[PDB]
Paper text:
Mtb protein Rv2498c is currently annotated as the β-subunit (CitE) of the heterotrimeric prokaryotic citrate lyase complex involved in TCA cycle cataplerosis. Combining phylogenetic analysis, in vitro enzymatic assays, in vivo Mtb experiments, and X-ray crystallography, we identified Mtb Rv2498c as an essential stereospecific bifunctional β-hydroxyacyl-CoA lyase (β-HAC lyase) that carries out the last step of itaconate dissimilation pathway and confers resistance to itaconate. A systematic evaluation of substrate specificity revealed (R)-HMG-CoA ∼ (S)-citramalyl-CoA >>> (S)-malyl-CoA ∼ β-methylmalyl-CoA as substrates for Rv2498c. To investigate the molecular basis of Rv2498c substrate stereospecificity for the carbon–carbon bond, we determined the structures of Rv2498c in a variety of liganded states by X-ray crystallography.
Author numbering:
A (entry chain B), B (entry chain C), C (entry chain A): 10 to 277
The structure:
Amino acid sequence: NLRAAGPGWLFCPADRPERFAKAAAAADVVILDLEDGVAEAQKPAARNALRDTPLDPERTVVRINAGGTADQARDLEALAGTAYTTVMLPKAESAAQVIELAPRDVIALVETARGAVCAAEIAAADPTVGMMWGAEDLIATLGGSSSRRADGAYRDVARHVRSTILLAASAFGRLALDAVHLDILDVEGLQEEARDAAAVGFDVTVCIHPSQIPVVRKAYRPSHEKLAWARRVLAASRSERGAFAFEGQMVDSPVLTHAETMLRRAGE
Amino acid sequence: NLRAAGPGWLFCPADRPERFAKAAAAADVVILDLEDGVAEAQKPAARNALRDTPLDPERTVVRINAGGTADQARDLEALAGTAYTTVMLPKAESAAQVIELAPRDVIALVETARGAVCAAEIAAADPTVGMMWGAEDLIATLGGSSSRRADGAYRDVARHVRSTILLAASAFGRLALDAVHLDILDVEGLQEEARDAAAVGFDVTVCIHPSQIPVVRKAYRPSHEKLAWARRVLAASRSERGAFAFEGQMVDSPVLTHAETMLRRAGE
Amino acid sequence: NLRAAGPGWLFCPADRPERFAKAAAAADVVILDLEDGVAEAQKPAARNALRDTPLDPERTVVRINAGGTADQARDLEALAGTAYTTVMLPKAESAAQVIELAPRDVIALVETARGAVCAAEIAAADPTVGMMWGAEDLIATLGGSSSRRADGAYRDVARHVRSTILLAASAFGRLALDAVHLDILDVEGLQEEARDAAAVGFDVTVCIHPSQIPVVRKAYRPSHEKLAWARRVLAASRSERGAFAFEGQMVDSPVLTHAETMLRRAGE
Ligand SMILES: CC(C)(COP(=O)(O)OP(=O)(O)OC[C@H]1O[C@@H](n2cnc3c(N)ncnc32)[C@H](O)[C@@H]1OP(=O)(O)O)[C@@H](O)C(=O)NCCC(=O)NCCS
Ligand SMILES: CC(C)(COP(=O)(O)OP(=O)(O)OC[C@H]1O[C@@H](n2cnc3c(N)ncnc32)[C@H](O)[C@@H]1OP(=O)(O)O)[C@@H](O)C(=O)NCCC(=O)NCCS
Ligand SMILES: CC(C)(COP(=O)(O)OP(=O)(O)OC[C@H]1O[C@@H](n2cnc3c(N)ncnc32)[C@H](O)[C@@H]1OP(=O)(O)O)[C@@H](O)C(=O)NCCC(=O)NCCS
Ligand SMILES: [Mg+2]
Ligand SMILES: [Mg+2]
Ligand SMILES: [Mg+2]
């Protein structure tokens, strides 16, 4: 039940076991990384550390290597000596890549054009429990050079893939995870992203530094002004029958659902 | 031939029959609503109203309840006592949901992640004559809480689904209907939306208040500046062979088509 | 190997053979146009010009007419008398339209809703070596009247299709070609577009005037500021193993790939 954890998930390289406990303490869910966070020469040591420094398997996911690679094979061998049951699959590009990871639960990280093109097949695969997107491998594999424009906003194709993943995940009832914010000190930019992610239905914002978790948790709580409105409209709705105008707005079922969702997030 | 009616379509709850004639007078097409506009407890009375206060079936559509619901069964039973032949299907999620509504004409309202993912299949279904998108059920079903950002623009996933629906509809020659504007007094925002809808090829902007119709109709006629240009380029084109530069712009077939479409709209 | 040619491709109407050598001199690759650049009445003459005034077939593409048209038939007949082996297919709408052009290499120009819906199938077709998108026929066929909003940006549906084609192209290892800039003297607007195109992984910006070519070649060279950063981060990486923080940013494999890609571009 990762769907009950909290929105602040945190990457930690698997070759840094001295930080595992810190990460577990700071975050709702830790993603121990055997992939791009760790250099090739350091992967074997990272795998040893996984086995030798267990976190709670109910709140820890392991990002393994891409399908068909020698590393993934070594990863799955190492995982056989752990109690970890959920993995994150990078460069997820087909349903088959997820299905071969049975009986583990899988979070598919779509971060290539092929993955975007196949997002719905990947989402529908049986072991999938969530979908994440990655802007940086996406731009890298497209042969590009930057995921953001001068003003910091994501370039269109990244914005496009983010929506693609959110819909693919939601269409098949999977968790949706938003991309990492690479500018560590940029709490302002992270706050804006997290608030928007929360508004559109993402379940999680993945973080790369523990200082980011409190920003993400706060961002997933609706503002005082949003909560006041949620309260007002739901109260007025108790006296109405069908569509009605409230504070100049046409309100009915899905709008009341937004209000309920806001109060739910405030409560939990 | 809804195709031949104006762009101003107007929802009216079916449990408000004293407003039917008003709605029919103000709008090009009326959508009598048996779904979210009407509370569950009032649906039977709305169904009775549908039978007892008929509107011109050549300019009226009935939004029924979602596929697989007991409410949709009751709606279709009530529909049997009417002349209405076009229905709007909310939460359209598969070609099958549309096909089972034969022999009626169907406008598919895609307002869920699954709908967006399956948009093209829904558009290609035989009884489909139109596609609409719905931002609020979309966000609600995603688990989100806000369809628009602080400055009022639709969030990315809504913009994405809008374009998805326009393309799916056009690829199969269906009418495309743009989403409702819930801020009733926000004539400014409606105007902005409706002008853009007209410019990209939407056939209709759906309205929730009769005061919105005049705004939509005006927004769908190109501005004086656009029409002057259309006239100029087309005049110039009659003495042209192939691509040519007009007022510093490269002009060929599709640009001339744009100009003709403007003048056609001014004509209509 | 059009992939090894620069990013500056130039359309020239096939009924203007006195400009062929000029085109060839200015551009990296010339696209000789038998479609919309040429009026129907001038097409047979254009076809004679193609035969009578040959360009280097290793650096020339021919845009033929759409699938199923009498004009395409005549285009292919005319082409049998040339050494041209790559064609551009306008209004590309299915894999079948591409496959029937074997054994020639095909750049599929997607510029209709159907094309956008079928983009991945088109890209995957065996003869496809490139995908381009066309904003003006897109709006034209949707029944719209302008591809850009007041401030000059492309409307959403065009931005949507652009990303769609970039992903489809890249998912199947095809060249990705960005859309023409119709405002000839707007070199500032072209610069912005081309820089973004290069940043997200487009291989080509297609031009309609030889004055645009220098702008495009310059835009595909990363700025002094970006190159400075690429040098720094890659130098720093040779001292690191795995993810590291550089100048406040989380850095790992794909980001370093971005840097390498910038330097590769500066080298070319
Ligand atoms: C980028 C990174 C290497 C920075 O290292 P750094 O220079 O040591 O960062 P800081 O100096 O700001 O460290 C601050 C504190 O937080 C800790 N910390 C930083 N990142 C951490 C992480 N991902 N997990 C656990 N603890 C972390 C540090 O250990 C340090 O703790 P301490 O002062 O109590 O000893 C680190 O943030 C990191 O590993 N991020 C994740 C990278 C990753 O996994 N990428 C793969 C997918 S994007
Ligand atoms: C939101 C709503 C309930 C507001 O009702 P309201 O409080 O009466 O709004 P107003 O006071 O501004 O109404 C003004 C006039 O316009 C009429 N009117 C308002 N909305 C109307 C509608 N959708 N159809 C017909 N007439 C309408 C009212 O009857 C009133 O007429 P009158 O003065 O001649 O008697 C109403 O706009 C409505 O029902 N909209 C449609 C809701 C819907 O169908 N949602 C589902 C799909 S999104
Ligand atoms: C738009 C167009 C007709 C402009 O005509 P124009 O008025 O003659 O252009 P200019 O006056 O700026 O010409 C300037 C010079 O560039 C040349 N030139 C302009 N466009 C050229 C082209 N597409 N190919 C080769 N040479 C071109 C002209 O011959 C002229 O050369 P010169 O004066 O050194 O002898 C011409 O640019 C053109 O044909 N563009 C392509 C249209 C097209 O192919 N559309 C279909 C796909 S989008
Ligand atoms: Mg990655
Ligand atoms: Mg709805
Ligand atoms: Mg075209």
